[PDB]
Assembly symmetry: C2
Homo-oligomer: 69 residues x 2
Amino acid sequence: SSQKEQDVLTPRECLILQEVEKGFTNQEIADALHLSKRSIEYSLTSIFNKLNVGSRTEAVLIAKSDGVL
Amino acid sequence: SSQKEQDVLTPRECLILQEVEKGFTNQEIADALHLSKRSIEYSLTSIFNKLNVGSRTEAVLIAKSDGVL
């Protein structure tokens, strides 16, 4: 639970991460969740707060750092 | 030379990567190169092509994947 950070996030936020950390971008996340590059960006900017991510770059970076991918 | 992909890039493009792969975002790249979020984004979107990066996410992701950070 509190051990995790990238997966302890909200279900969508976790989906967000996996789609960024995937190795594409927020646009692919939108494409994945069926949202929009506009919609997920609002989740990326908030993941900036939640995951202490810089904006998106850490969302994908920290995942590998942790061992997620 | 041809072995590298992330660092074989243009001097700026390499600087771009290191600032994304750093663990902040393109905005920190802008702030690092003293450009702008609007100018580096133009480099990120082209690094999409150069590095085969998905937009920016791979720029920071693939770095760790390779062992850059």
